[PDB]
Enzyme design. Sequence first.
Site, PDB file in Angstrom:
ATOM      1  N   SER A 109       0.853  -1.187   0.000  1.00 25.72           N
ATOM      2  CA  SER A 109       0.000   0.000   0.000  1.00 25.72           C
ATOM      3  C   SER A 109       0.889   1.237   0.000  1.00 25.72           C
ATOM      4  O   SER A 109       1.785   1.333  -0.859  1.00 25.72           O
ATOM      5  CB  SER A 109      -0.996  -0.089   1.207  1.00 25.72           C
ATOM      6  OG  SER A 109      -1.546   1.157   1.669  1.00 25.72           O
ATOM      7  N   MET A 110       0.682   2.192   0.880  1.00 23.50           N
ATOM      8  CA  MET A 110       1.559   3.345   0.915  1.00 23.50           C
ATOM      9  C   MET A 110       3.002   2.930   1.227  1.00 23.50           C
ATOM     10  O   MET A 110       3.925   3.675   0.900  1.00 23.50           O
ATOM     11  CB  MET A 110       1.086   4.391   1.923  1.00 23.50           C
ATOM     12  CG  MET A 110      -0.185   5.087   1.465  1.00 23.50           C
ATOM     13  SD  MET A 110      -0.570   6.396   2.603  1.00 23.50           S
ATOM     14  CE  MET A 110      -2.222   6.882   2.024  1.00 23.50           C
ATOM     15  N   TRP A 138       0.482   2.190  -3.449  1.00 26.25           N
ATOM     16  CA  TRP A 138      -0.251   3.439  -3.524  1.00 26.25           C
ATOM     17  C   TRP A 138       0.749   4.584  -3.500  1.00 26.25           C
ATOM     18  O   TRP A 138       1.582   4.656  -2.608  1.00 26.25           O
ATOM     19  CB  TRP A 138      -1.167   3.550  -2.290  1.00 26.25           C
ATOM     20  CG  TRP A 138      -2.151   4.712  -2.252  1.00 26.25           C
ATOM     21  CD1 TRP A 138      -3.511   4.614  -2.404  1.00 26.25           C
ATOM     22  CD2 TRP A 138      -1.907   6.070  -1.880  1.00 26.25           C
ATOM     23  NE1 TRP A 138      -4.082   5.829  -2.218  1.00 26.25           N
ATOM     24  CE2 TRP A 138      -3.152   6.771  -1.883  1.00 26.25           C
ATOM     25  CE3 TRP A 138      -0.779   6.820  -1.566  1.00 26.25           C
ATOM     26  CZ2 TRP A 138      -3.239   8.119  -1.569  1.00 26.25           C
ATOM     27  CZ3 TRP A 138      -0.872   8.145  -1.272  1.00 26.25           C
ATOM     28  CH2 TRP A 138      -2.098   8.793  -1.223  1.00 26.25           C
ATOM     29  N   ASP A 198      -8.533  -4.553  -6.926  1.00 25.98           N
ATOM     30  CA  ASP A 198      -8.205  -3.565  -5.909  1.00 25.98           C
ATOM     31  C   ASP A 198      -9.017  -2.280  -6.107  1.00 25.98           C
ATOM     32  O   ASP A 198      -8.846  -1.595  -7.107  1.00 25.98           O
ATOM     33  CB  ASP A 198      -6.710  -3.257  -6.002  1.00 25.98           C
ATOM     34  CG  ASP A 198      -6.150  -2.515  -4.818  1.00 25.98           C
ATOM     35  OD1 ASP A 198      -6.846  -1.705  -4.210  1.00 25.98           O
ATOM     36  OD2 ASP A 198      -4.872  -2.711  -4.576  1.00 25.98           O
ATOM     37  N   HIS A 246      -7.243  -5.553  -2.362  1.00 28.81           N
ATOM     38  CA  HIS A 246      -6.144  -4.732  -1.879  1.00 28.81           C
ATOM     39  C   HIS A 246      -5.472  -5.412  -0.691  1.00 28.81           C
ATOM     40  O   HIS A 246      -4.269  -5.152  -0.455  1.00 28.81           O
ATOM     41  CB  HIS A 246      -6.647  -3.382  -1.411  1.00 28.81           C
ATOM     42  CG  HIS A 246      -5.555  -2.427  -0.991  1.00 28.81           C
ATOM     43  ND1 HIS A 246      -4.653  -1.917  -1.906  1.00 28.81           N
ATOM     44  CD2 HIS A 246      -5.262  -1.901   0.183  1.00 28.81           C
ATOM     45  CE1 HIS A 246      -3.821  -1.105  -1.262  1.00 28.81           C
ATOM     46  NE2 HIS A 246      -4.175  -1.076   0.005  1.00 28.81           N
TER      47      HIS A 246
END
Length: 258
Positions: A130-131, A155, A176, A208
């Site tokens: 993710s981030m 992300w 996602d 996700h």
Amino acid sequence: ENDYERGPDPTSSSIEASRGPYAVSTKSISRFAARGFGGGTIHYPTTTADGTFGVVAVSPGYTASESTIRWLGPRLASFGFVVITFDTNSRYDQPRARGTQLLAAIDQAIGDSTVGSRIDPSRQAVVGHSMGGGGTLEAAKTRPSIEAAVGLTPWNLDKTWPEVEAAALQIGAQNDSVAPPRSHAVPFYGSLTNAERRAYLELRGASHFAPNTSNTTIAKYTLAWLKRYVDDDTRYEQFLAPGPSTGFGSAVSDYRIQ
Ligand SMILES: [Ca+2]
Ligand SMILES: [Ca+2]
């Protein structure tokens, strides 16, 4: 000739195994003992008999604790890596901050009294969800000498990555809705013009949160990528090219490598 090869010659079966050939030891780092990140766990091969290993940091994603990515620690370490899984300073840290913390986790492991002598500090890699996956690109931009970067359903608001020289793999999830690959992973892959190697692998039918549970497809390709580029281990090129099938029953819906 390659000084950095570890372990037996691989097979599809071997790279799918829950544990590789190394027994793993672990060292905890409290939040307040951590320099530049929120605490974590170092996972390392117990044996010193085979030489030193590359060092890999693994970041969680937005809102998330270390527990969401901890499974990668013992699994990757058991194939011959020193792996630091960690918590961030804030659960709501953005990709830039996660990049800085990836590098801080690497650097603390490099200097650590237990595992520093087990690491080759010239051979570093970053993995994240993710981030945290966006943070892998941030870290590889800041520290161009990073060997390899693996983003898991990454992300990042910044879609362009010409600064990255590392070998960079993005693993997207087809369904996602948080970091859709069409607007995150796939743009990153496309813009990685200067990367030593670039790849995109999409998990069929996946959400996700697929990287937060043990997942053989994620593990095998993360492993192969890290072996190929942290260890320069050409024995693992066979898994990357032509790469996974995308046909009936495959866990992969899209695969690209350049
Ligand atoms: Ca950019
Ligand atoms: Ca390399």
